[PDB]
Amino acid sequence: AGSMEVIATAHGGPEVLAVRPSSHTPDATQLEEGQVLVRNAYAGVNFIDTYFLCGLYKKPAMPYVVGEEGAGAVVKVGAGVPESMLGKRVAYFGGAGCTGSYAAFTVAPASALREVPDGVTDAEAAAVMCQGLTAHYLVDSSYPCGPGSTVVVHAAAGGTGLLVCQMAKLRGARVIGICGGAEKATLARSVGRADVVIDYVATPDWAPLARAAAPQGVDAVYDGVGQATFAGSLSVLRPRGYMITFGNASGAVPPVSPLELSRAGSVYLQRPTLGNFMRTPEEAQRRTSEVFGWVASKQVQLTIGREYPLHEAAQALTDLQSRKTTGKLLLKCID
């Protein structure tokens, strides 16, 4: 009973998680300059949570409060932060200076907080900060989708994949989704709005099929899957096309010889991370305004699955690593 948070007690899988009382309640928290205390309504569940949990990515300390992404309201501000921020609805995708979002209360730098508009719910905000802003920069910056573009999207029925499909379509591109199983393919076609969907259970040789569908050539591949798809993804690109590897789901990509990228056709390789696309207030506001606007105006459809109670964070991470369609998973932070 009361304000809780979820901590990692060691590296590993969901078994290492434990629930404890919140260590950042308002009455116990002395905010430093620039810091803000957020009362979370929801934490978003993300693959990156599992990479910190297992050790592929490194946290500054152990134990630590799990979770990157959250949405809530400002309840306390430190020096140099305006009082007008108190009570404002904010969302964040995490980073240094942020404590974990799997928690009743999170400390974050004021600069990491994005204001949530009145027309977007707390749950929608916690669904878009990581996956929605990643989909935004993928089709806006990593490879700038336009009416002349054809792109391939891996895991097109997953959380980020469905949003990449929709936002690339909104930019005018032609979208070729790849995913596994007939139900995921239906999802990528109906919610993702992909032009073509290849089901690699039905057709395991997906690379020649993508190329045959795009005689004009594939300009970019958005591949969040990692090592298992890397070589096939390179093989579908037109010369000087873009390989955008932005996830590790099947395992991190091993080292690549540059001369191998040469033999694939002088292609570009990028391994982006969201922080490099949220670098200034103007860029951060442009991305959140556009995504929030698309959600509120219902031009982008979010696919939100279960809202777990906070103490079932282990189950949510387990369900996340299942091969099953789950929709965006959220944790309800307020009991």
Locus of tokens 């290849």: 198
Gyration radius from the chain CA atoms: 20
Instruction: Answer yes or no: do 241 and 313 share one domain.
Output: no
The CA–CA distances, whole Å, from 188 to 167, 176, 180, 219 equal: 13, 10, 10, 20
110-145 core/surface letters (b: 16 or more CB in 10 A; e: else) = bebbbebeeebbbbbbbbbbbbbbbbbbbbbbbbeb
* Residue 306 amino acid letter: R
| Separation of alpha carbons 97 and 94, rounded Å | 8
Q: Does residue 144 form part of some domain? A: yes
Give the phi and the psi of residue 135 in degrees, each rounded to 5: -55, -40
The number of folded domains in the chain is 2
Q: Which residues on neighbouring strands pair with residue 176, listed in sequence order?
A: 152, 196
Q: How far apart are the first and last CA of the chain?
A: 8
Q: Does residue 282 form part of some domain? A: no
Q: Which residues on neighbouring strands pair with residue 129, listed in sequence order?
A: none
Beta strands in the chain (DSSP E): 4-8, 17-21, 35-44, 64-65, 69-77, 89-92, 105-109, 114-115, 150-153, 174-179, 196-199, 218-223, 237-245, 268-270, 304-309, 328-332
In this structure, the number of other CB atoms found within 10 A of the CB of residue 285 comes to: 13
| Separation of alpha carbons 125 and 91, rounded Å | 6
Name the region of 156 (left: φ>0; alpha: ψ -120 to 50; beta: rest): alpha
Instruction: Answer yes or no: do 314 and 260 share one domain.
Output: no
Q: Does residue 19 form part of some domain? A: yes
Instruction: Answer yes or no: do 105 and 192 share one domain.
Output: no
Q: Does residue 294 form part of some domain? A: no
Q: Which residues on neighbouring strands pair with residue 105, listed in sequence order?
A: 39
| Separation of alpha carbons 208 and 123, rounded Å | 40
Strands 17-21 and 35-44 turn out to be unpaired
Domain endpoint, select from 257, 275, 293: 275
The CA–CA distances, whole Å, from 246 to 106, 193, 230, 259 equal: 26, 21, 11, 21
Instruction: Answer yes or no: do 255 and 327 share one domain.
Output: no
Give the phi and the psi of residue 216 in degrees, each rounded to 5: -70, -15
| Separation of alpha carbons 261 and 263, rounded Å | 6
Secondary structure (3-state) at 69: strand
Say if CB 26 and CB 40 are below 8 A apart: no
> What is the CA 262 to chain-centroid distance, rounded?
30
Domain endpoint, select from 255, 275, 295: 275
Strands 150-153 and 174-179 turn out to be parallel
Q: Does residue 281 form part of some domain? A: no
Instruction: Answer yes or no: do 231 and 254 share one domain.
Output: yes
Instruction: Answer yes or no: do 92 and 201 share one domain.
Output: no
Concatenated DSSP letters for 115-157?
A: EPPTTS-HHHHHHHTTHHHHHHHIIIIIS---TT-EEEETTTT
Say if CB 227 and CB 252 are below 8 A apart: yes
Instruction: Answer yes or no: do 271 and 142 share one domain.
Output: yes
Say if CB 310 and CB 6 are below 8 A apart: yes
Instruction: Answer yes or no: do 122 and 201 share one domain.
Output: no
Handedness of CA 73, 126, 54, 15 (dihedral sign): positive
Question: What CATH number corresponds to the domain at position 39?
Answer: 3.90.180.10
Query: H-helix or E-strand containing 95?
Result: none
Say if CB 55 and CB 11 are below 8 A apart: yes
Say if CB 120 and CB 91 are below 8 A apart: no
| Separation of alpha carbons 77 and 109, rounded Å | 10
- Domain enclosing residue 327, as ranges: 4-129+303-332
Q: Which residues on neighbouring strands pair with residue 299, listed in sequence order?
A: none
| Separation of alpha carbons 106 and 31, rounded Å | 11
Handedness of CA 210, 192, 240, 201 (dihedral sign): negative
Q: Does residue 297 form part of some domain? A: no
Instruction: Answer yes or no: do 117 and 220 share one domain.
Output: no
Secondary structure (3-state) at 199: strand
Say if CB 225 and CB 323 are below 8 A apart: no
Tokens in use for 200?
């690699």
In this structure, the number of other CB atoms found within 10 A of the CB of residue 32 comes to: 11
| Separation of alpha carbons 196 and 171, rounded Å | 17
Q: Does residue 292 form part of some domain? A: no
Instruction: Answer yes or no: do 85 and 197 share one domain.
Output: no
Domain endpoint, select from 260, 275, 290: 275
* Residue 277 amino acid letter: F
Question: What CATH number corresponds to the domain at position 260?
Answer: 3.40.50.720
Which of 54, 40, 12 is closest to 101 using CA atoms?
Answer: 40
Instruction: Answer yes or no: do 183 and 240 share one domain.
Output: yes
Say if CB 284 and CB 111 are below 8 A apart: no
Documented resolution in Å = 2.0
| Separation of alpha carbons 332 and 159, rounded Å | 18
Instruction: Answer yes or no: do 271 and 140 share one domain.
Output: yes
In this structure, the number of other CB atoms found within 10 A of the CB of residue 276 comes to: 12
In this structure, the number of other CB atoms found within 10 A of the CB of residue 26 comes to: 13
Q: Does residue 295 form part of some domain? A: no
